[PDB]
Structures are given as C-alpha cells and as structure tokens.
C-alpha cells in the first residue's frame, strides 16, 4: 500500500480540449506531486494533464461527472 507508485503532472496542456474528445478524468492531489492537477483520458485512452483552475477544465469535469 505505501509502496504504490504515484502519478504526477509536471506540465499543463495549454490548449483546451473538446468535450467530445474526453472519456474520463482523475484528480491528482498527492503532496508528493509538484501540485494538484487533473488528468484527462481521451476517447483513445490518451492521458493529458490540465490546470484545475481553468474554467474549461472545471466545465469539463462537471460534464464528465454529470455524464453517465
């Protein structure tokens, strides 16, 4: 349990992502990371780090959450 790996974000995509391209998201909060972040999973399983504070990032989360 304590020796599990931790995934972190070292960069934030600077280009917004279409919601029709998103499949799911993860919340990164480990103090082991440089900072809290959001990881988007695209339709094709690609992972992308985004800034939790940007309006579109929050609007996406709200959408994926309200989704099925």
């Amino acid at each position: 349990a304590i020796n599990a790996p931790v995934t972190c974000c070292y960069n934030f995509t600077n280009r917004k992502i279409s919601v029709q391209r998103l499949a799911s998201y993860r919340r990164i909060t480990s103090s082991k990371c440089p900072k809290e972040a959001v990881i988007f999973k695209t339709i094709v399983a690609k992972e992308i780090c985004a800034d939790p504070k940007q309006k579109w990032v929050q609007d996406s989360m709200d959408h994926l959450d309200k989704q099925t």
Partner: antibody
Framework: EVQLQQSGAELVKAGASVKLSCPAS????????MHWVKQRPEQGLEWIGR????????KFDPKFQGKATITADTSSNTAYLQLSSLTSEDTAVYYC??????????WGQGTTLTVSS | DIQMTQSSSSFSVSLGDRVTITCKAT??????LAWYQQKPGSAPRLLIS???SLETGVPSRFSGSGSGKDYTLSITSLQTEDVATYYC?????????FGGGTKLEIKR
C-alpha cells in the same frame, strides 16, 4: 510534507475587527485554493470562502459577505481571514485549508476566536 | 444551497463490529462527496473524497459508496481510535456544505 500553522488564539472586543493568519509550508499556495472554515459546538462546520493566491480572486458563501475578507501573500506563503464588527455570534474556531477541488485534504490546527471585552 | 443531513447524530457501538454512517444530499451531487473524521481537539481529517477515493494514510477498513444523493461511510472491525465524529461534505457546487455530523460512542 504539507503543513499549515495558525494564530492559535485571539481575544477581541465586540464591534472590533480581527485578522487571522495561516502560514503554509511544504507547498505553494499559488498552485491551489485556500479556504477558511468556521466551526461552532452547536452549529458545526461552515465553509466561508476561498482565495486563489495566484490572481487574488475570492468566492464567498453570501452568508459571510461583509464580515469576512480573505486575502493572501504568495511571498510569505500565507493566507488571511479578516472579520469585521465582531459579535458573540462570531466567536468560534476558524480553520484554513487547501483544496483546489472543493474538499479539504490539508488543514491548519485551527485558531480559537473569543469575542469578549 | 445544497443541504446535507446524516441519518443520526450519534451511534453507540462495539469495538470490532461494522459501523455505517449515512449521508443524504438535497439534490444529486455526482459523487462529489467527501468524508471527514474529527476528534475533540483538532481539525477534521479527510478520509474519503470522490465518494470512493481513500486518502493514502487512511486505514483500509474505511470505505465509502453511494450515488446521486445517498452516500455511506463504512468502518469494519471498529478500533478504539476510530471513535470520533464523522462529517460528510459536498463539493459539487459552492457554497460548500457539510452534514451535521455523526458521533460514535462506545456502548457499555
């Protein structure tokens, strides 16, 4: 690791104002949202507001507008909570916490505020 | 605002058995619920967020689940250190709000 320090205790006269401070270490408050939460034995936990130390924007629970002023300093990595024209209804325990998403994974030990004369 | 309420504000329990605390939201909150534990002299401690996500330093006997408007925290083989007050909190939309809390007491 992440750790938040708080003023600890405060004694202020009714009608006066007070400014509570919460210094952070182990993280940079720029990268997150700093919140303040009020707690009373009787009425429990209450979220007051948050501040984005990066741009200085705040969000408040209307119930605290004009009584609570949240401010921050990225240099000293400190968050502040100002309370104006205090009343006995204001005496309680005040916590500051981190939480870009809305829940709070890191808290300060809290600062007790007693409105007395 | 969204109002959070908990089944009861208190439960008398026994060391070792399973304990369940219930939370009910005023409206759907899409798993954006968090659970906290708080003992008499300190700040609340985050145990679970996202309704299911367990904070790292939290014992595996703690777990949560539910959806829409109904959520529950579950503690298996209750330990004495587990006796405290538990609060549910919603983070779907501001103003963020907590449940009134459920205090655990040991029966005798």
């Amino acid at each position: 690791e992440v750790q938040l320090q708080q003023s600890g205790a405060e004694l202020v006269k009714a009608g006066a104002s007070v400014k509570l401070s919460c210094p952070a270490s182990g993280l940079n408050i720029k990268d997150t949202y700093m919140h303040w939460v009020k707690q009373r034995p009787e009425q429990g936990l209450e979220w007051i507001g948050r501040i984005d130390p990066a741009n200085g924007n705040t969000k408040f629970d209307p119930k605290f507008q004009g009584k609570a002023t949240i401010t921050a300093d990225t240099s000293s990595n400190t968050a502040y909570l100002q309370l104006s024209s205090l009343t006995s209804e204001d005496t309680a325990v005040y916590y500051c916490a981190r939480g870009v998403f809305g829940f709070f994974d890191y808290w300060g030990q809290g600062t007790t505020l007693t409105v007395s004369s | 605002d969204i109002q959070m309420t908990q089944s009861s504000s208190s439960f008398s329990v026994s060391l070792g058995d399973r304990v369940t605390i219930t939370c009910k939201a005023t409206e759907d909150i899409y798993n954006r619920l968090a659970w906290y534990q708080q003992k008499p002299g300190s700040a609340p401690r985050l145990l679970i967020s996202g309704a299911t996500s367990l904070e790292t330093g939290v014992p595996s006997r703690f777990s949560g689940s539910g959806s829409g408007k109904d959520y529950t925290l579950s503690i298996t083989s209750l330990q004495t250190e587990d006796v405290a007050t538990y609060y549910c909190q919603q983070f779907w939309s501001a103003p963020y709000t907590f449940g009134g809390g459920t205090k655990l007491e040991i029966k005798r």
